[PDB]
UniProtKB/Swiss-Prot annotation:
Cofactor annotation comment: Binds 1 Ca(2+) ion per subunit.
Residues that bind Ca(2+): E52, N54, V57, E62
UniProt activity-regulation remark: Is inhibited by scorpion cyclotide trypsin inhibitor TopI1.
UniProt GO molecular function: endopeptidase activity; metal ion binding; serine-type endopeptidase activity; serpin family protein binding
Protein name, UniProt field: Serine protease 1
Length: 223
C-alpha cells in the first residue's frame, strides 16, 4: 500500500496473509472455513494466517491453518485477469473472536464515490521496493467506470472497477493482491492489478465481488 497508514493491530480482523514459506498475497475471511482471494495468487501449498499484524513476529493472536482445497473461478483468464477471484477452504474452522472476524458479502454493488478501506502488507514505494511488516490501510473511493476505462482502454470488463486517486500518490501495489476493499461493511473488491503503483492516471483495478455472490454461496455450500 503506498501513501496509506498503519492500521493498528487487529483493526481489520477479516484480513488474511497467504503464506507458502513467506507472505505472497492477502485474502478475506468470509466465514470460519472459507477465504476469498485473487485467482492470480493461486499456489499449491498455502497456509492461511489469521490475526496477523506484524507478519515476521508471533505476537500471540494468530491462527495458522492449511488450506484443504482452492477453487479458482471457472472463467478466470490469466491473460486479462478477468474473473480474478479464488476461494480457499481451511482444513479446520478458524476460531472467530475480536481479532479474527469474517466480512460480509454485498447485497448490491457500490456506487462510484463510495469510500472504501484497502489493506495489505504490500510494497509501500511507487518507484522502489519497501515491504512493511505491519498492515497498512488506505481509504480510497470507487471511481466512475468512465475514468477507469479511459486509463485502461480495452482492458476493463464488467467484473472490474477502479478505486483510488487519478492524481496518484495513494494506491494498493504488489504484495497487496488478493486483499480486501471493504465499503459500507461489505467486501466489494479484491486487489487485482494496476499499471505500477500510485502513478498518475493509473488507479488500481479490483475484482467486482458483487457479481460473484451467487457463485461464492453455491460453491461453498457444495464443498
Ligand atoms: N496499481 C496497483 N494498485 C497495483 C499494482 C500491482 C502490481 I505492479 C502487481 C500486483 C498487484 C498490483 S495492484
Ligand atoms: Ca505475527
Amino acid at each position: 500500500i503506498v501513501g496509506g497508514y498503519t492500521c493498528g493491530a487487529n483493526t481489520v480482523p477479516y484480513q488474511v496473509s497467504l503464506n507458502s514459506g513467506y507472505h505472497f498475497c492477502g485474502g478475506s475471511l468470509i466465514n470460519s472455513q472459507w477465504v476469498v482471494s485473487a485467482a492470480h495468487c493461486y499456489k499449491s501449498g498455502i497456509q492461511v494466517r489469521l490475526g496477523e499484524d506484524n507478519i515476521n513476529v508471533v505476537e500471540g493472536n494468530e491462527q495458522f491453518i492449511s488450506a484443504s482445497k482452492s477453487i479458482v473461478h471457472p472463467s478466470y483468464n490469466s491473460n486479462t485477469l478477468n474473473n480474478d477471484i479464488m476461494l480457499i477452504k481451511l482444513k479446520s474452522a478458524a476460531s472467530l473472536n475480536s481479532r479474527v472476524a469474517s466480512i460480509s458479502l454485498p447485497t448490491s454493488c457500490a456506487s462510484a464515490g463510495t469510500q472504501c478501506l484497502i489493506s495489505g502488507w504490500g510494497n509501500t514505494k511507487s518507484s522502489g521496493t519497501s515491504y512493511p511488516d505491519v498492515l497498512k490501510c488506505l481509504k480510497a473511493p470507487i471511481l466512475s467506470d468512465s475514468s477507469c476505462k479511459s486509463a485502461y482502454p480495452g482492458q476493463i470488463t464488467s467484473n472490474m472497477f477502479c478505486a483510488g486517486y487519478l492524481e496518484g500518490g495513494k494506491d494498493s501495489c504488489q504484495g497487496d493482491s488478493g486483499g480486501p476493499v471493504v465499503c459500507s461493511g461489505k467486501l466489494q473488491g479484491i486487489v487485482s492489478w494496476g499499471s505500477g503503483c500510485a502513478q498518475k492516471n493509473k488507479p488500481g483495478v479490483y475484482t467486482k465481488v458483487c457479481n460473484y455472490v451467487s457463485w461464492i454461496k453455491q460453491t461453498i455450500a457444495s464443498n
